[PDB]
Design a protein around this ligand. Structure first.
Ligand SMILES: [Hg+2]
Ligand SMILES: [Hg+2]
Ligand SMILES: [Hg+2]
Ligand SMILES: [Hg+2]
Ligand SMILES: [Hg+2]
Ligand SMILES: [Hg+2]
Length: 263
């Protein structure tokens, strides 16, 4: 059950003015592709706050990667789901090395040393890499049953150039005449239920590959791409959401650089 939105004053959407004319804003299965200019964040914030949405953000930080937690979490505090309930889950081999980062109200951090707990604690899960920093808004516009993110190196590439697993002997196999996009493994998410479905499917496929003596060319990312080919995501994030400015610069098509590699 969803309550009514309140009265809001904003610019009328214009039916005969395309939103962006330089990029695809909807997939052929009618999932939005999230670019700056496509969303009114005030409307979306209202919708998700009225549901008291809780977002879990999961990161693995092992060995030397614990060094990246401070910047990751500090910048998440500035830019990630601000105004909403956030639960950070930091999976690490070094619990005592997790930095003491000051959190805004309604935000919490759990340290898990290296599950149904997610079903009871959060509505959505967002799974990212720790060697990153938030540079701009990453908010409820991403939330949906299942999303993937366009890999910044391949968003302009034809499908035959995608680095999918190409050996038929692998469960991650995708032939040259298949594929919508190349999704990057470093940023995906969805409802808890859909994320757990995905991770279960990939884990099983990886076990089958191991038993057959084969390891997919890009490991979990290869399996992610196979999963999202066969189970279409309900939103796709543009490369605004996963960028490397040193490698790739700042193309005109990116109005914002939201979540980036660390230099
Ligand atoms: Hg628009
Ligand atoms: Hg996750
Ligand atoms: Hg994760
Ligand atoms: Hg998979
Ligand atoms: Hg996996
Ligand atoms: Hg996966």
């Amino acid at each position: 059950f969803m309550v009514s939105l309140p009265r809001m004053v904003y610019p009328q959407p214009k039916v005969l003015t395309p939103c962006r004319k330089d990029v695809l804003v909807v997939t052929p299965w009618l999932a939005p592709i999230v670019w700056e200019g496509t969303f009114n964040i005030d409307i979306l914030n209202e919708q998700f706050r009225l549901q008291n949405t809780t977002i879990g953000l999961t990161v693995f930080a092992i060995k030397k990667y614990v060094a990246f937690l401070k910047l990751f979490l500090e910048t998440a505090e500035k830019h990630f789901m601000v105004g909403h309930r956030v639960h950070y889950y930091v999976f690490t081999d070094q619990p005592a090395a997790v930095p003491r980062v000051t959190l805004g109200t309604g935000r919490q951090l759990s340290v898990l040393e290296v599950e149904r707990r997610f079903l009871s604690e959060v509505d959505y899960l967002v799974c990212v890499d720790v060697d990153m920093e938030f540079r701009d808004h990453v908010g409820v516009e991403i939330l949906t049953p299942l999303f993937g993110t366009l890999h910044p190196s391949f968003y302009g590439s034809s499908r035959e150039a995608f680095t999918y697993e190409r050996r038929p002997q692998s469960q991650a196999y995708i032939p040259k005449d298949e594929g919508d996009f190349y999704y990057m493994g470093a940023f995906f998410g969805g409802s808890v239920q859909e994320v757990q479905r995905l991770t279960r499917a990939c884990h099983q496929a990886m076990m089958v590959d191991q038993a057959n003596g084969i390891e997919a060319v890009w490991h979990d990312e290869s399996h992610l791409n196979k999963y999202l080919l066969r189970h279409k995501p309900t939103k796709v994030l543009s490369p605004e959401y996963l960028w490397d400015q040193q490698l790739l610069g700042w193309p005109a098509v990116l109005r914002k650089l939201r979540f980036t590699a660390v230099p």
